Amino acid sequence: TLAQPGGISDPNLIKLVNKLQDVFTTVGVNNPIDLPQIVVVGSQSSGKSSVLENIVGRDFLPRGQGIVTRRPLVLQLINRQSSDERLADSTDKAANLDEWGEFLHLPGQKFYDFNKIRDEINRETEAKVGRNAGISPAPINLRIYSPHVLNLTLVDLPGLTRVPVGDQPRDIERQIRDMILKYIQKPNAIILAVTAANVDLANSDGLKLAREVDPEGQRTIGVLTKVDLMDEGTDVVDILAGRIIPLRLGYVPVVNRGQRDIDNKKPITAALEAEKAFFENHKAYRNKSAYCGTPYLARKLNLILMMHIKQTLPDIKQRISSSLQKYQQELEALGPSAESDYTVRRRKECQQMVESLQRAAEIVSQV
Ligand SMILES: Nc1nc2c(ncn2[C@@H]2O[C@H](COP(=O)(O)OP(=O)(O)CP(=O)(O)O)[C@@H](O)[C@H]2O)c(=O)[nH]1
Ligand SMILES: [Mg+2]
C-alpha cells in the first residue's frame, strides 16, 4: 500500500495529525493545519515526473522520452479509512479496495489500478492537446484516497523548453514559464528544483525559476537526477557540498529508472535497490551515502511537513492555557459542591471543560 516509513506517508506522521485533529476538535478549532504543495519544476526531460511519483510510492504518472507531461496534474491525496470483481481485471499487483483514484473529468469512476490512472492521464492529455507536443495549462485533477496518506497536494508540470516543437506556438517558453509560476508563486509551495546531473547546474531552469520566487531558498530543494549518466570520473560532490549554487535546504542526488527500465516495467522496489547500490559502490558517493537517493529526499519532505504541523502548536498551546485559566477562575468563584440549579450545572460545565482542556494540553506536550 501507500504507507512507507520516512516519507510523506510515514505512519507516525499520519498518527500525529489525527491526534492533533482530535485536540483541535476538543477545543473547537477548525483544522488549522495547512500543508504545503509539492511542485516539480525544471527543464524538459530532466526527470520531474519520475521524482514526483517516487514521493507518492506507487507508479501512476506517464514517463518516457520526448515531450511527455503536457498538462499540469494536480494530485490531491485524501485520507480515508477502510470501509471482489472490482479488482478482477486489475493489472496492478498492489491494487486494494482501500486505495483508489478519482478524476474530476470522470466523476463516479474509481481507479484501483494505478496503471489505468496513468493511462487516463495520457488519454486525457491527448484528448485536449493532441499527439504533436501541444501544451495546455488546463490541469488534470486527480484525487487518490488511502488510509495511509495525508491531506496533501502534489503537482506535476510540463518542463521548460527553448525551441517549440510540433504544434507548439512560437512563444511556448513563456507559456510554460507562466504556467509553472502559478503553482510555485504561492508562499507555501515546496519547490523541487529538478536538474539533470549530466548538464551543468548553471543551465538549470528549475534553479533559475525557483530563485525568482524563493530568493532565500526557504522552500526550494535541489534534486539532481540522472547521476548514473554522468561522464566517467565526474560527480556532483561539489554541488552537494554547497560550492556551486548553494541552497539552504541543500541538494539530493537520485538515480531513477532509465528508459530501458521503463520498457521492461521494472518495479519501483527494484529501482530503489539499484539506486541504493549505485551510491554505495560509487567512489564519489560511498561517503555519507545515506544522504543520497530517493529515500533521503522523502526524509527532507517528511521533516518539512513535520515543521508545518508543529508550526500550529504555539497558537493552540496559548489558547488552551488562557482558556484553562478562565474556567479555573470560574470554578474558584462557584466554590466547592441545597444550591441553585444554575450553580450546580455551571459548576459541572466548568469542570468538564477543565478536564477536556487538561487532557488536550497533555497530548500536545507528549508530541
Ligand atoms: N538513467 C536515468 N534515466 C532517467 C532518470 N530519471 C529519468 N530518466 C529517464 O529520462 C526520461 C524522462 O523521464 P521523466 O520522468 O518522464 O521526465 P520529465 O521531466 O517528467 C519529462 P517532461 O518534461 O516531458 O514532462 C525517461 O526516459 C526516463 O527513463 C535517472 O535518474 N536515470
Ligand atoms: Mg513529466
Side-chain angles (χ1 to χ4, degrees), residues 1-20 22-29 31-92 94-127 129-169 171-181 183-185 187-282 284-324 326-351 353-358 360-367:
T1 68
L2 288 170
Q4 290 297 326
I8 63 167
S9 302
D10 181 75
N12 294 321
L13 190 59
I14 278 64
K15 292 184 174 182
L16 172 56
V17 172
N18 291 335
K19 260 160 63 278
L20 290 173
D22 292 2
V23 164
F24 302 156
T25 284
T26 64
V27 170
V29 205
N31 183 263
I33 298 169
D34 188 11
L35 300 176
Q37 294 179 358
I38 306 176
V39 186
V40 285
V41 304
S43 297
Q44 191 279 329
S45 198
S46 60
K48 299 180 297 306
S49 296
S50 300
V51 167
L52 197 66
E53 87 175 348
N54 288 333
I55 294 167
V56 177
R58 272 177 78 176
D59 296 352
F60 72 99
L61 291 178
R63 294 154 38 244
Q65 295 182 97
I67 314 302
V68 181
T69 309
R70 297 183 286 123
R71 290 178 60 185
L73 187 132
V74 182
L75 170 58
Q76 183 180 358
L77 298 175
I78 299 173
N79 188 271
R80 178 176 293 187
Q81 298 304 335
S82 180
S83 304
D84 280 16
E85 58 273 318
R86 305 135 76 183
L87 320 171
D89 306 321
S90 167
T91 63
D92 182 3
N96 65 94
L97 296 174
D98 291 350
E99 304 182 329
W100 70 92
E102 291 185 21
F103 287 99
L104 184 62
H105 67 282
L106 293 175
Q109 183 174 352
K110 293 185 177 184
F111 291 79
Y112 300 95
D113 185 337
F114 274 44
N115 292 319
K116 299 293 181 59
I117 296 178
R118 182 184 52 199
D119 288 352
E120 180 58 29
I121 294 165
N122 187 255
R123 183 180 300 101
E124 176 57 21
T125 296
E126 295 181 11
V129 293
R131 297 171 43 79
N132 198 25
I135 297 299
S136 168
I140 298 173
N141 288 104
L142 173 62
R143 284 183 298 104
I144 290 178
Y145 295 85
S146 172
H148 315 292
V149 300
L150 294 171
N151 295 319
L152 192 59
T153 294
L154 295 72
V155 181
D156 193 13
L157 294 170
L160 199 51
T161 54
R162 301 292 181 269
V163 184
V165 170
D167 298 339
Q168 296 176 350
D171 69 331
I172 185 59
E173 181 174 357
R174 196 190 67 258
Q175 291 183 17
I176 297 174
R177 180 178 170 276
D178 294 352
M179 182 189 309
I180 296 168
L181 289 172
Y183 292 94
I184 64 176
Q185 264 173 342
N188 208 217
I190 295 172
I191 306 171
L192 299 181
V194 179
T195 314
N198 52 3
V199 302
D200 192 342
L201 197 66
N203 291 292
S204 175
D205 272 313
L207 290 173
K208 179 180 180 183
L209 205 58
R211 279 154 65 98
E212 280 177 40
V213 304
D214 183 18
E216 296 304 329
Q218 301 171 3
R219 52 190 183 90
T220 300
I221 300 173
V223 182
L224 302 172
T225 63
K226 306 184 179 184
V227 178
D228 56 320
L229 299 183
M230 295 186 70
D231 192 21
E232 185 181 356
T234 72
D235 56 62
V236 297
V237 173
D238 285 336
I239 298 169
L240 306 181
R243 289 171 157 178
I244 309 302
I245 296 168
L247 287 173
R248 185 183 311 262
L249 301 177
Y251 292 82
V252 180
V254 300
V255 173
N256 293 326
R257 282 164 287 185
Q259 187 59 42
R260 185 148 290 177
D261 295 336
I262 291 178
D263 297 340
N264 295 331
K265 294 178 176 59
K266 186 173 188 174
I268 189 168
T269 303
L272 295 167
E273 294 179 358
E275 178 183 52
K276 181 177 182 63
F278 173 89
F279 291 114
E280 289 182 347
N281 292 292
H282 201 291
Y285 309 117
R286 56 182 57 259
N287 180 98
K288 257 230 205 107
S289 65
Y291 291 62
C292 297
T294 299
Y296 180 55
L297 174 60
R299 287 171 63 179
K300 277 188 172 167
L301 297 172
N302 175 284
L303 293 170
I304 292 174
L305 295 175
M306 282 271 281
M307 194 186 62
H308 280 94
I309 294 168
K310 285 183 172 60
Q311 178 179 355
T312 69
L313 301 183
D315 281 337
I316 297 296
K317 287 182 180 185
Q318 212 292 316
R319 176 176 198 183
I320 292 175
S321 294
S322 66
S323 181
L324 181 57
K326 184 176 71 61
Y327 280 96
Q328 288 180 327
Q329 277 186 326
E330 191 164 4
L331 268 172
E332 96 193 353
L334 300 174
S337 172
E339 212 168 13
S340 171
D341 276 6
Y342 163 71
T343 301
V344 299
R345 101 167 198 163
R346 183 57 184 171
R347 187 186 289 111
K348 284 177 164 59
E349 291 176 349
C350 291
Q351 170 59 13
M353 279 296 297
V354 170
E355 295 171 0
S356 296
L357 294 165
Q358 287 178 329
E362 59 88 3
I363 297 169
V364 182
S365 177
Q366 295 299 311
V367 169

